[PDB]
PDB file of all heavy atoms in Angstrom:
ATOM      1  N   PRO Y   1     132.417 -61.668  -3.257  1.00 19.75           N
ATOM      2  CA  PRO Y   1     133.769 -61.532  -2.441  1.00 19.75           C
ATOM      3  C   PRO Y   1     133.674 -60.352  -1.578  1.00 19.75           C
ATOM      4  O   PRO Y   1     134.321 -60.359  -0.471  1.00 19.75           O
ATOM      5  CB  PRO Y   1     134.692 -61.350  -3.430  1.00 19.75           C
ATOM      6  CG  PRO Y   1     134.267 -62.195  -4.617  1.00 19.75           C
ATOM      7  CD  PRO Y   1     132.741 -61.968  -4.673  1.00 19.75           C
ATOM      8  N   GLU Y   2     132.840 -59.308  -1.933  1.00 18.41           N
ATOM      9  CA  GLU Y   2     132.766 -58.116  -1.093  1.00 18.41           C
ATOM     10  C   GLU Y   2     132.089 -58.463   0.119  1.00 18.41           C
ATOM     11  O   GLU Y   2     132.191 -57.711   1.181  1.00 18.41           O
ATOM     12  CB  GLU Y   2     132.066 -57.053  -1.751  1.00 18.41           C
ATOM     13  CG  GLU Y   2     130.596 -57.442  -2.250  1.00 18.41           C
ATOM     14  CD  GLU Y   2     130.530 -57.775  -3.690  1.00 18.41           C
ATOM     15  OE1 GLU Y   2     131.490 -58.488  -4.263  1.00 18.41           O
ATOM     16  OE2 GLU Y   2     129.542 -57.312  -4.319  1.00 18.41           O
ATOM     17  N   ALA Y   3     131.377 -59.585   0.220  1.00 18.62           N
ATOM     18  CA  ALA Y   3     130.498 -59.835   1.383  1.00 18.62           C
ATOM     19  C   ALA Y   3     131.146 -60.733   2.363  1.00 18.62           C
ATOM     20  O   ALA Y   3     130.433 -61.136   3.346  1.00 18.62           O
ATOM     21  CB  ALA Y   3     129.217 -60.436   0.901  1.00 18.62           C
ATOM     22  N   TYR Y   4     132.333 -61.295   2.173  1.00 18.04           N
ATOM     23  CA  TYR Y   4     132.971 -62.071   3.123  1.00 18.04           C
ATOM     24  C   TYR Y   4     134.402 -61.867   3.256  1.00 18.04           C
ATOM     25  O   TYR Y   4     135.120 -61.526   2.242  1.00 18.04           O
ATOM     26  CB  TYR Y   4     132.670 -63.619   2.944  1.00 18.04           C
ATOM     27  CG  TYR Y   4     133.326 -64.191   1.733  1.00 18.04           C
ATOM     28  CD1 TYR Y   4     134.473 -64.903   1.725  1.00 18.04           C
ATOM     29  CD2 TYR Y   4     132.708 -64.107   0.456  1.00 18.04           C
ATOM     30  CE1 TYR Y   4     135.033 -65.514   0.670  1.00 18.04           C
ATOM     31  CE2 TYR Y   4     133.198 -64.708  -0.701  1.00 18.04           C
ATOM     32  CZ  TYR Y   4     134.435 -65.280  -0.600  1.00 18.04           C
ATOM     33  OH  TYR Y   4     135.012 -65.999  -1.688  1.00 18.04           O
ATOM     34  N   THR Y   5     135.072 -62.388   4.296  1.00 20.96           N
ATOM     35  CA  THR Y   5     136.486 -62.485   4.470  1.00 20.96           C
ATOM     36  C   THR Y   5     136.752 -63.812   5.303  1.00 20.96           C
ATOM     37  O   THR Y   5     136.150 -64.087   6.273  1.00 20.96           O
ATOM     38  CB  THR Y   5     136.990 -61.328   5.413  1.00 20.96           C
ATOM     39  OG1 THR Y   5     136.639 -60.146   4.916  1.00 20.96           O
ATOM     40  CG2 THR Y   5     138.593 -61.395   5.516  1.00 20.96           C
ATOM     41  N   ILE Y   6     137.598 -64.674   4.747  1.00 26.21           N
ATOM     42  CA  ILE Y   6     138.042 -65.902   5.463  1.00 26.21           C
ATOM     43  C   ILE Y   6     139.187 -65.655   6.230  1.00 26.21           C
ATOM     44  O   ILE Y   6     140.260 -65.100   5.751  1.00 26.21           O
ATOM     45  CB  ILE Y   6     138.211 -66.941   4.394  1.00 26.21           C
ATOM     46  CG1 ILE Y   6     137.043 -67.111   3.562  1.00 26.21           C
ATOM     47  CG2 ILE Y   6     138.695 -68.250   5.084  1.00 26.21           C
ATOM     48  CD1 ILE Y   6     137.181 -68.109   2.401  1.00 26.21           C
ATOM     49  N   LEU Y   7     139.156 -66.071   7.545  1.00 27.33           N
ATOM     50  CA  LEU Y   7     140.272 -65.894   8.506  1.00 27.33           C
ATOM     51  C   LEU Y   7     140.446 -67.335   9.149  1.00 27.33           C
ATOM     52  O   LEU Y   7     139.429 -68.055   9.416  1.00 27.33           O
ATOM     53  CB  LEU Y   7     140.059 -64.850   9.568  1.00 27.33           C
ATOM     54  CG  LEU Y   7     140.036 -63.433   9.142  1.00 27.33           C
ATOM     55  CD1 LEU Y   7     139.676 -62.552  10.218  1.00 27.33           C
ATOM     56  CD2 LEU Y   7     141.418 -62.972   8.471  1.00 27.33           C
ATOM     57  N   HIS Y   8     141.720 -67.639   9.349  1.00 29.26           N
ATOM     58  CA  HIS Y   8     142.067 -68.964   9.978  1.00 29.26           C
ATOM     59  C   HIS Y   8     141.579 -69.073  11.449  1.00 29.26           C
ATOM     60  O   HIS Y   8     141.944 -68.166  12.272  1.00 29.26           O
ATOM     61  CB  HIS Y   8     143.476 -69.375   9.825  1.00 29.26           C
ATOM     62  CG  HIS Y   8     143.713 -70.781  10.381  1.00 29.26           C
ATOM     63  ND1 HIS Y   8     144.454 -70.918  11.568  1.00 29.26           N
ATOM     64  CD2 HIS Y   8     143.391 -71.930   9.892  1.00 29.26           C
ATOM     65  CE1 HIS Y   8     144.530 -72.186  11.811  1.00 29.26           C
ATOM     66  NE2 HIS Y   8     143.807 -72.882  10.800  1.00 29.26           N
ATOM     67  N   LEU Y   9     140.829 -69.948  11.789  1.00 31.04           N
ATOM     68  CA  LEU Y   9     140.489 -70.275  13.187  1.00 31.04           C
ATOM     69  C   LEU Y   9     140.449 -71.814  13.373  1.00 31.04           C
ATOM     70  O   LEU Y   9     139.594 -72.608  12.704  1.00 31.04           O
ATOM     71  CB  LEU Y   9     139.094 -69.743  13.554  1.00 31.04           C
ATOM     72  CG  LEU Y   9     138.567 -70.201  14.940  1.00 31.04           C
ATOM     73  CD1 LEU Y   9     139.395 -69.607  16.088  1.00 31.04           C
ATOM     74  CD2 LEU Y   9     137.151 -69.644  15.035  1.00 31.04           C
ATOM     75  N   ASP Y  10     141.229 -72.357  14.198  1.00 29.12           N
ATOM     76  CA  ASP Y  10     141.165 -73.808  14.607  1.00 29.12           C
ATOM     77  C   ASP Y  10     140.813 -73.718  16.162  1.00 29.12           C
ATOM     78  O   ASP Y  10     141.666 -73.483  16.968  1.00 29.12           O
ATOM     79  CB  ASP Y  10     142.605 -74.385  14.547  1.00 29.12           C
ATOM     80  CG  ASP Y  10     142.653 -75.842  15.005  1.00 29.12           C
ATOM     81  OD1 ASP Y  10     141.670 -76.349  15.408  1.00 29.12           O
ATOM     82  OD2 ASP Y  10     143.691 -76.426  14.861  1.00 29.12           O
ATOM     83  N   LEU Y  11     139.496 -74.008  16.450  1.00 28.73           N
ATOM     84  CA  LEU Y  11     139.050 -73.954  17.823  1.00 28.73           C
ATOM     85  C   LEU Y  11     139.640 -74.935  18.687  1.00 28.73           C
ATOM     86  O   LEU Y  11     139.489 -74.812  19.878  1.00 28.73           O
ATOM     87  CB  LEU Y  11     137.525 -74.187  17.827  1.00 28.73           C
ATOM     88  CG  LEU Y  11     136.752 -73.004  17.315  1.00 28.73           C
ATOM     89  CD1 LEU Y  11     135.334 -73.352  16.903  1.00 28.73           C
ATOM     90  CD2 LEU Y  11     136.658 -71.874  18.334  1.00 28.73           C
ATOM     91  N   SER Y  12     140.291 -75.955  18.193  1.00 27.42           N
ATOM     92  CA  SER Y  12     140.982 -76.922  19.026  1.00 27.42           C
ATOM     93  C   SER Y  12     142.352 -76.464  19.430  1.00 27.42           C
ATOM     94  O   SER Y  12     143.030 -77.285  20.168  1.00 27.42           O
ATOM     95  CB  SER Y  12     141.173 -78.223  18.178  1.00 27.42           C
ATOM     96  OG  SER Y  12     142.255 -78.086  17.227  1.00 27.42           O
ATOM     97  N   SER Y  13     142.766 -75.225  19.052  1.00 27.30           N
ATOM     98  CA  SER Y  13     143.963 -74.743  19.579  1.00 27.30           C
ATOM     99  C   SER Y  13     143.786 -73.269  20.290  1.00 27.30           C
ATOM    100  O   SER Y  13     143.279 -72.381  19.489  1.00 27.30           O
ATOM    101  CB  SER Y  13     144.970 -74.506  18.479  1.00 27.30           C
ATOM    102  OG  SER Y  13     146.189 -73.663  18.827  1.00 27.30           O
ATOM    103  N   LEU Y  14     144.094 -73.153  21.518  1.00 30.83           N
ATOM    104  CA  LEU Y  14     143.727 -71.877  22.114  1.00 30.83           C
ATOM    105  C   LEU Y  14     144.735 -70.763  21.471  1.00 30.83           C
ATOM    106  O   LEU Y  14     144.277 -69.585  21.373  1.00 30.83           O
ATOM    107  CB  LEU Y  14     143.986 -71.998  23.569  1.00 30.83           C
ATOM    108  CG  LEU Y  14     143.070 -72.903  24.190  1.00 30.83           C
ATOM    109  CD1 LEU Y  14     143.387 -73.081  25.783  1.00 30.83           C
ATOM    110  CD2 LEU Y  14     141.617 -72.494  24.040  1.00 30.83           C
ATOM    111  N   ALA Y  15     145.977 -70.969  21.055  1.00 28.35           N
ATOM    112  CA  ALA Y  15     146.766 -70.121  20.307  1.00 28.35           C
ATOM    113  C   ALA Y  15     146.093 -69.667  19.033  1.00 28.35           C
ATOM    114  O   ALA Y  15     146.206 -68.505  18.619  1.00 28.35           O
ATOM    115  CB  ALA Y  15     148.096 -70.582  20.164  1.00 28.35           C
ATOM    116  N   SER Y  16     145.440 -70.646  18.331  1.00 25.02           N
ATOM    117  CA  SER Y  16     144.673 -70.225  17.160  1.00 25.02           C
ATOM    118  C   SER Y  16     143.632 -69.367  17.355  1.00 25.02           C
ATOM    119  O   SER Y  16     143.304 -68.499  16.563  1.00 25.02           O
ATOM    120  CB  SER Y  16     144.308 -71.556  16.376  1.00 25.02           C
ATOM    121  OG  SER Y  16     143.647 -71.209  15.313  1.00 25.02           O
ATOM    122  N   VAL Y  17     142.838 -69.542  18.490  1.00 19.91           N
ATOM    123  CA  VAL Y  17     141.768 -68.644  18.784  1.00 19.91           C
ATOM    124  C   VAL Y  17     142.336 -67.205  18.901  1.00 19.91           C
ATOM    125  O   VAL Y  17     141.789 -66.349  18.395  1.00 19.91           O
ATOM    126  CB  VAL Y  17     141.091 -69.194  20.196  1.00 19.91           C
ATOM    127  CG1 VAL Y  17     139.974 -68.214  20.523  1.00 19.91           C
ATOM    128  CG2 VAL Y  17     140.383 -70.512  19.821  1.00 19.91           C
ATOM    129  N   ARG Y  18     143.310 -67.197  19.774  1.00 20.85           N
ATOM    130  CA  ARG Y  18     143.992 -65.845  20.040  1.00 20.85           C
ATOM    131  C   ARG Y  18     144.481 -65.185  18.678  1.00 20.85           C
ATOM    132  O   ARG Y  18     144.366 -64.088  18.427  1.00 20.85           O
ATOM    133  CB  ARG Y  18     145.090 -65.829  20.960  1.00 20.85           C
ATOM    134  CG  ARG Y  18     144.569 -66.116  22.284  1.00 20.85           C
ATOM    135  CD  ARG Y  18     145.602 -66.112  23.458  1.00 20.85           C
ATOM    136  NE  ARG Y  18     145.017 -66.303  24.701  1.00 20.85           N
ATOM    137  CZ  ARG Y  18     144.838 -67.312  25.464  1.00 20.85           C
ATOM    138  NH1 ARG Y  18     145.465 -68.541  25.053  1.00 20.85           N
ATOM    139  NH2 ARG Y  18     144.215 -67.252  26.732  1.00 20.85           N
ATOM    140  N   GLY Y  19     145.057 -65.996  17.738  1.00 17.68           N
ATOM    141  CA  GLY Y  19     145.467 -65.555  16.418  1.00 17.68           C
ATOM    142  C   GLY Y  19     144.385 -65.069  15.558  1.00 17.68           C
ATOM    143  O   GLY Y  19     144.443 -64.094  14.813  1.00 17.68           O
ATOM    144  N   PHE Y  20     143.358 -65.878  15.596  1.00 13.57           N
ATOM    145  CA  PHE Y  20     142.109 -65.439  14.834  1.00 13.57           C
ATOM    146  C   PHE Y  20     141.611 -64.083  15.284  1.00 13.57           C
ATOM    147  O   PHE Y  20     141.302 -63.236  14.602  1.00 13.57           O
ATOM    148  CB  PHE Y  20     140.922 -66.474  15.012  1.00 13.57           C
ATOM    149  CG  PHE Y  20     139.614 -65.991  14.588  1.00 13.57           C
ATOM    150  CD1 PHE Y  20     139.292 -65.927  13.162  1.00 13.57           C
ATOM    151  CD2 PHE Y  20     138.687 -65.383  15.370  1.00 13.57           C
ATOM    152  CE1 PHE Y  20     138.193 -65.257  12.741  1.00 13.57           C
ATOM    153  CE2 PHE Y  20     137.466 -64.727  14.929  1.00 13.57           C
ATOM    154  CZ  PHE Y  20     137.247 -64.775  13.637  1.00 13.57           C
ATOM    155  N   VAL Y  21     141.497 -63.950  16.624  1.00 13.44           N
ATOM    156  CA  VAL Y  21     140.948 -62.563  17.203  1.00 13.44           C
ATOM    157  C   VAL Y  21     141.921 -61.548  16.670  1.00 13.44           C
ATOM    158  O   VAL Y  21     141.443 -60.487  16.361  1.00 13.44           O
ATOM    159  CB  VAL Y  21     140.810 -62.770  18.699  1.00 13.44           C
ATOM    160  CG1 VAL Y  21     140.635 -61.434  19.387  1.00 13.44           C
ATOM    161  CG2 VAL Y  21     139.724 -63.720  19.070  1.00 13.44           C
ATOM    162  N   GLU Y  22     143.184 -61.755  16.756  1.00 13.78           N
ATOM    163  CA  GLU Y  22     144.173 -60.742  16.328  1.00 13.78           C
ATOM    164  C   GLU Y  22     143.913 -60.434  14.826  1.00 13.78           C
ATOM    165  O   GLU Y  22     143.869 -59.237  14.450  1.00 13.78           O
ATOM    166  CB  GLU Y  22     145.709 -61.352  16.484  1.00 13.78           C
ATOM    167  CG  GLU Y  22     146.737 -60.483  15.877  1.00 13.78           C
ATOM    168  CD  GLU Y  22     148.112 -61.042  16.096  1.00 13.78           C
ATOM    169  OE1 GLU Y  22     148.214 -62.242  15.891  1.00 13.78           O
ATOM    170  OE2 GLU Y  22     149.038 -60.442  16.436  1.00 13.78           O
ATOM    171  N   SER Y  23     143.808 -61.392  13.982  1.00 13.83           N
ATOM    172  CA  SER Y  23     143.456 -61.171  12.549  1.00 13.83           C
ATOM    173  C   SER Y  23     142.180 -60.353  12.334  1.00 13.83           C
ATOM    174  O   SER Y  23     142.134 -59.555  11.505  1.00 13.83           O
ATOM    175  CB  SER Y  23     143.497 -62.504  11.818  1.00 13.83           C
ATOM    176  OG  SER Y  23     144.727 -63.090  11.858  1.00 13.83           O
ATOM    177  N   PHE Y  24     141.097 -60.745  13.036  1.00 13.93           N
ATOM    178  CA  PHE Y  24     139.870 -60.132  12.967  1.00 13.93           C
ATOM    179  C   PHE Y  24     140.042 -58.712  13.381  1.00 13.93           C
ATOM    180  O   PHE Y  24     139.488 -57.764  12.663  1.00 13.93           O
ATOM    181  CB  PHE Y  24     138.909 -60.857  13.819  1.00 13.93           C
ATOM    182  CG  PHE Y  24     137.549 -60.021  13.802  1.00 13.93           C
ATOM    183  CD1 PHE Y  24     136.871 -59.673  12.750  1.00 13.93           C
ATOM    184  CD2 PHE Y  24     137.331 -59.305  14.982  1.00 13.93           C
ATOM    185  CE1 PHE Y  24     135.749 -58.907  12.839  1.00 13.93           C
ATOM    186  CE2 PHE Y  24     136.170 -58.440  15.079  1.00 13.93           C
ATOM    187  CZ  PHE Y  24     135.419 -58.243  13.968  1.00 13.93           C
ATOM    188  N   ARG Y  25     140.559 -58.444  14.531  1.00 12.52           N
ATOM    189  CA  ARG Y  25     140.705 -57.055  14.914  1.00 12.52           C
ATOM    190  C   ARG Y  25     141.556 -56.229  14.050  1.00 12.52           C
ATOM    191  O   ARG Y  25     141.303 -55.011  13.869  1.00 12.52           O
ATOM    192  CB  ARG Y  25     141.403 -57.115  16.422  1.00 12.52           C
ATOM    193  CG  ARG Y  25     140.367 -57.494  17.385  1.00 12.52           C
ATOM    194  CD  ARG Y  25     140.880 -57.712  18.786  1.00 12.52           C
ATOM    195  NE  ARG Y  25     140.041 -58.140  19.759  1.00 12.52           N
ATOM    196  CZ  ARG Y  25     140.309 -58.603  20.932  1.00 12.52           C
ATOM    197  NH1 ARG Y  25     141.496 -58.504  21.412  1.00 12.52           N
ATOM    198  NH2 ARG Y  25     139.366 -59.061  21.713  1.00 12.52           N
ATOM    199  N   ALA Y  26     142.571 -56.805  13.391  1.00 12.63           N
ATOM    200  CA  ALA Y  26     143.273 -56.009  12.357  1.00 12.63           C
ATOM    201  C   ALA Y  26     142.464 -55.428  11.160  1.00 12.63           C
ATOM    202  O   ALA Y  26     142.898 -54.533  10.525  1.00 12.63           O
ATOM    203  CB  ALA Y  26     144.470 -56.821  11.913  1.00 12.63           C
ATOM    204  N   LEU Y  27     141.314 -55.996  10.907  1.00 10.48           N
ATOM    205  CA  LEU Y  27     140.401 -55.586   9.924  1.00 10.48           C
ATOM    206  C   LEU Y  27     139.751 -54.136  10.114  1.00 10.48           C
ATOM    207  O   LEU Y  27     139.338 -53.574   9.247  1.00 10.48           O
ATOM    208  CB  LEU Y  27     139.455 -56.549   9.463  1.00 10.48           C
ATOM    209  CG  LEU Y  27     139.835 -57.942   9.197  1.00 10.48           C
ATOM    210  CD1 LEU Y  27     138.579 -58.816   9.065  1.00 10.48           C
ATOM    211  CD2 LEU Y  27     140.725 -58.026   7.866  1.00 10.48           C
ATOM    212  N   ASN Y  28     139.785 -53.811  11.433  1.00 12.99           N
ATOM    213  CA  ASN Y  28     139.211 -52.510  11.869  1.00 12.99           C
ATOM    214  C   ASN Y  28     137.686 -52.491  11.435  1.00 12.99           C
ATOM    215  O   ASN Y  28     137.285 -51.339  10.865  1.00 12.99           O
ATOM    216  CB  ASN Y  28     139.948 -51.317  11.374  1.00 12.99           C
ATOM    217  CG  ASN Y  28     141.406 -51.342  11.790  1.00 12.99           C
ATOM    218  OD1 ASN Y  28     142.312 -51.133  11.033  1.00 12.99           O
ATOM    219  ND2 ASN Y  28     141.518 -51.731  13.044  1.00 12.99           N
ATOM    220  N   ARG Y  29     137.039 -53.642  11.598  1.00 12.71           N
ATOM    221  CA  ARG Y  29     135.543 -53.649  11.316  1.00 12.71           C
ATOM    222  C   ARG Y  29     134.845 -53.676  12.618  1.00 12.71           C
ATOM    223  O   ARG Y  29     135.104 -54.716  13.396  1.00 12.71           O
ATOM    224  CB  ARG Y  29     135.189 -54.886  10.406  1.00 12.71           C
ATOM    225  CG  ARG Y  29     135.832 -54.911   9.042  1.00 12.71           C
ATOM    226  CD  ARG Y  29     135.153 -56.061   8.286  1.00 12.71           C
ATOM    227  NE  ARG Y  29     133.832 -55.801   7.953  1.00 12.71           N
ATOM    228  CZ  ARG Y  29     133.266 -55.172   6.940  1.00 12.71           C
ATOM    229  NH1 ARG Y  29     134.074 -55.018   5.884  1.00 12.71           N
ATOM    230  NH2 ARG Y  29     132.056 -54.804   6.891  1.00 12.71           N
ATOM    231  N   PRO Y  30     133.891 -52.897  12.934  1.00 13.41           N
ATOM    232  CA  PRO Y  30     133.142 -53.086  14.177  1.00 13.41           C
ATOM    233  C   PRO Y  30     132.236 -54.309  14.185  1.00 13.41           C
ATOM    234  O   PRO Y  30     131.700 -54.588  13.026  1.00 13.41           O
ATOM    235  CB  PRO Y  30     132.285 -51.791  14.390  1.00 13.41           C
ATOM    236  CG  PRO Y  30     132.095 -51.345  12.925  1.00 13.41           C
ATOM    237  CD  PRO Y  30     133.457 -51.678  12.238  1.00 13.41           C
ATOM    238  N   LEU Y  31     132.142 -55.041  15.111  1.00 15.46           N
ATOM    239  CA  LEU Y  31     131.418 -56.263  15.283  1.00 15.46           C
ATOM    240  C   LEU Y  31     129.922 -56.038  15.625  1.00 15.46           C
ATOM    241  O   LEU Y  31     129.698 -55.450  16.659  1.00 15.46           O
ATOM    242  CB  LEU Y  31     132.094 -57.183  16.258  1.00 15.46           C
ATOM    243  CG  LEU Y  31     131.559 -58.713  16.163  1.00 15.46           C
ATOM    244  CD1 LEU Y  31     131.735 -59.304  14.853  1.00 15.46           C
ATOM    245  CD2 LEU Y  31     132.344 -59.459  17.223  1.00 15.46           C
ATOM    246  N   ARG Y  32     129.071 -56.665  14.914  1.00 15.06           N
ATOM    247  CA  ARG Y  32     127.618 -56.613  15.313  1.00 15.06           C
ATOM    248  C   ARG Y  32     127.155 -58.003  15.853  1.00 15.06           C
ATOM    249  O   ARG Y  32     126.362 -58.069  16.768  1.00 15.06           O
ATOM    250  CB  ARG Y  32     126.791 -56.231  14.238  1.00 15.06           C
ATOM    251  CG  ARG Y  32     125.385 -56.118  14.529  1.00 15.06           C
ATOM    252  CD  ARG Y  32     124.444 -55.489  13.470  1.00 15.06           C
ATOM    253  NE  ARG Y  32     123.042 -55.729  13.644  1.00 15.06           N
ATOM    254  CZ  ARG Y  32     122.183 -55.499  12.667  1.00 15.06           C
ATOM    255  NH1 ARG Y  32     122.408 -54.998  11.625  1.00 15.06           N
ATOM    256  NH2 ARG Y  32     120.911 -55.996  12.940  1.00 15.06           N
ATOM    257  N   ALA Y  33     127.582 -59.077  15.407  1.00 15.61           N
ATOM    258  CA  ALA Y  33     127.166 -60.337  15.796  1.00 15.61           C
ATOM    259  C   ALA Y  33     128.326 -61.499  15.835  1.00 15.61           C
ATOM    260  O   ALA Y  33     129.195 -61.373  14.953  1.00 15.61           O
ATOM    261  CB  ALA Y  33     125.928 -60.797  15.159  1.00 15.61           C
ATOM    262  N   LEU Y  34     128.023 -62.476  16.551  1.00 13.55           N
ATOM    263  CA  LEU Y  34     128.884 -63.716  16.626  1.00 13.55           C
ATOM    264  C   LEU Y  34     128.006 -64.876  16.701  1.00 13.55           C
ATOM    265  O   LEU Y  34     127.074 -64.953  17.440  1.00 13.55           O
ATOM    266  CB  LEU Y  34     129.879 -63.681  17.858  1.00 13.55           C
ATOM    267  CG  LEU Y  34     130.517 -65.020  18.042  1.00 13.55           C
ATOM    268  CD1 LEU Y  34     131.535 -65.484  17.004  1.00 13.55           C
ATOM    269  CD2 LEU Y  34     131.239 -64.918  19.510  1.00 13.55           C
ATOM    270  N   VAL Y  35     128.185 -65.839  15.739  1.00 12.33           N
ATOM    271  CA  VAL Y  35     127.585 -67.110  15.798  1.00 12.33           C
ATOM    272  C   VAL Y  35     128.538 -68.192  16.083  1.00 12.33           C
ATOM    273  O   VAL Y  35     129.534 -68.500  15.202  1.00 12.33           O
ATOM    274  CB  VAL Y  35     126.919 -67.334  14.362  1.00 12.33           C
ATOM    275  CG1 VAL Y  35     126.188 -68.700  14.422  1.00 12.33           C
ATOM    276  CG2 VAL Y  35     125.903 -66.292  14.027  1.00 12.33           C
ATOM    277  N   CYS Y  36     128.276 -69.008  17.140  1.00 15.11           N
ATOM    278  CA  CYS Y  36     129.131 -70.026  17.546  1.00 15.11           C
ATOM    279  C   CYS Y  36     128.459 -71.355  17.043  1.00 15.11           C
ATOM    280  O   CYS Y  36     127.463 -71.907  17.546  1.00 15.11           O
ATOM    281  CB  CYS Y  36     129.326 -70.178  18.936  1.00 15.11           C
ATOM    282  SG  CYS Y  36     130.344 -68.743  19.827  1.00 15.11           S
ATOM    283  N   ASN Y  37     128.864 -71.828  15.842  1.00 16.85           N
ATOM    284  CA  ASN Y  37     128.234 -72.832  15.131  1.00 16.85           C
ATOM    285  C   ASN Y  37     129.099 -74.061  14.960  1.00 16.85           C
ATOM    286  O   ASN Y  37     128.624 -75.258  14.824  1.00 16.85           O
ATOM    287  CB  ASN Y  37     127.916 -72.343  13.581  1.00 16.85           C
ATOM    288  CG  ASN Y  37     127.811 -73.339  12.670  1.00 16.85           C
ATOM    289  OD1 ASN Y  37     126.610 -73.870  12.537  1.00 16.85           O
ATOM    290  ND2 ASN Y  37     128.650 -73.696  11.918  1.00 16.85           N
ATOM    291  N   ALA Y  38     130.466 -73.891  14.872  1.00 15.71           N
ATOM    292  CA  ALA Y  38     131.351 -74.999  14.734  1.00 15.71           C
ATOM    293  C   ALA Y  38     131.037 -76.074  15.789  1.00 15.71           C
ATOM    294  O   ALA Y  38     131.000 -75.902  17.061  1.00 15.71           O
ATOM    295  CB  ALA Y  38     132.750 -74.741  14.775  1.00 15.71           C
ATOM    296  N   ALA Y  39     131.078 -77.401  15.347  1.00 13.33           N
ATOM    297  CA  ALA Y  39     130.987 -78.603  16.236  1.00 13.33           C
ATOM    298  C   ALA Y  39     131.618 -79.713  15.633  1.00 13.33           C
ATOM    299  O   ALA Y  39     131.508 -80.076  14.478  1.00 13.33           O
ATOM    300  CB  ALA Y  39     129.530 -78.967  16.471  1.00 13.33           C
ATOM    301  N   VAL Y  40     132.511 -80.375  16.383  1.00 14.27           N
ATOM    302  CA  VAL Y  40     133.183 -81.696  16.014  1.00 14.27           C
ATOM    303  C   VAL Y  40     132.527 -82.836  16.685  1.00 14.27           C
ATOM    304  O   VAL Y  40     132.146 -82.723  17.936  1.00 14.27           O
ATOM    305  CB  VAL Y  40     134.701 -81.562  16.130  1.00 14.27           C
ATOM    306  CG1 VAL Y  40     135.279 -80.450  15.267  1.00 14.27           C
ATOM    307  CG2 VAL Y  40     135.094 -81.419  17.550  1.00 14.27           C
ATOM    308  N   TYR Y  41     132.681 -83.988  16.120  1.00 14.52           N
ATOM    309  CA  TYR Y  41     132.088 -85.120  16.716  1.00 14.52           C
ATOM    310  C   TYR Y  41     132.922 -86.406  16.205  1.00 14.52           C
ATOM    311  O   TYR Y  41     133.115 -86.496  14.987  1.00 14.52           O
ATOM    312  CB  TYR Y  41     130.686 -85.298  16.320  1.00 14.52           C
ATOM    313  CG  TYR Y  41     129.912 -86.617  16.732  1.00 14.52           C
ATOM    314  CD1 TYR Y  41     130.193 -87.127  18.037  1.00 14.52           C
ATOM    315  CD2 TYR Y  41     129.109 -87.201  15.907  1.00 14.52           C
ATOM    316  CE1 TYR Y  41     129.490 -88.237  18.372  1.00 14.52           C
ATOM    317  CE2 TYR Y  41     128.379 -88.412  16.202  1.00 14.52           C
ATOM    318  CZ  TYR Y  41     128.531 -88.968  17.526  1.00 14.52           C
ATOM    319  OH  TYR Y  41     127.896 -89.955  17.879  1.00 14.52           O
ATOM    320  N   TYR Y  42     133.276 -87.200  17.022  1.00 13.48           N
ATOM    321  CA  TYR Y  42     134.175 -88.323  16.788  1.00 13.48           C
ATOM    322  C   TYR Y  42     133.572 -89.647  17.367  1.00 13.48           C
ATOM    323  O   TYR Y  42     134.055 -90.303  18.324  1.00 13.48           O
ATOM    324  CB  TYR Y  42     135.580 -88.012  17.312  1.00 13.48           C
ATOM    325  CG  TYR Y  42     136.110 -86.722  16.864  1.00 13.48           C
ATOM    326  CD1 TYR Y  42     136.243 -85.645  17.647  1.00 13.48           C
ATOM    327  CD2 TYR Y  42     136.464 -86.513  15.511  1.00 13.48           C
ATOM    328  CE1 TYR Y  42     136.699 -84.465  17.276  1.00 13.48           C
ATOM    329  CE2 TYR Y  42     137.012 -85.374  15.111  1.00 13.48           C
ATOM    330  CZ  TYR Y  42     137.140 -84.279  15.918  1.00 13.48           C
ATOM    331  OH  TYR Y  42     137.638 -83.087  15.528  1.00 13.48           O
ATOM    332  N   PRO Y  43     132.421 -90.103  16.463  1.00 15.16           N
ATOM    333  CA  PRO Y  43     131.697 -91.136  17.141  1.00 15.16           C
ATOM    334  C   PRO Y  43     132.331 -92.478  17.310  1.00 15.16           C
ATOM    335  O   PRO Y  43     131.912 -93.308  18.128  1.00 15.16           O
ATOM    336  CB  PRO Y  43     130.558 -91.304  16.099  1.00 15.16           C
ATOM    337  CG  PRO Y  43     131.192 -90.781  14.810  1.00 15.16           C
ATOM    338  CD  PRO Y  43     132.024 -89.664  15.266  1.00 15.16           C
TER     339      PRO Y  43
END
């Protein structure tokens, strides 16, 4: 548990993106990297 924090992010909602960034910034942790991995597919 010391190695992660879960924060809500729904990439399908721009307000959720902004709320995620707000929650992340409130942790006062400097950022080293970002991985854009999520992908949805509706065949």
Side-chain angles (χ1 to χ4, degrees):
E2 58 258 44
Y4 70 96
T5 305
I6 304 175
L7 294 175
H8 183 251
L9 171 65
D10 176 359
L11 285 160
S12 80
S13 168
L14 299 172
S16 180
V17 174
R18 293 185 171 97
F20 166 79
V21 169
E22 178 183 36
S23 297
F24 168 68
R25 287 174 179 173
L27 304 175
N28 306 134
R29 298 187 68 95
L31 190 60
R32 185 167 158 196
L34 167 64
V35 181
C36 296
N37 163 82
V40 299
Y41 176 40
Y42 305 109

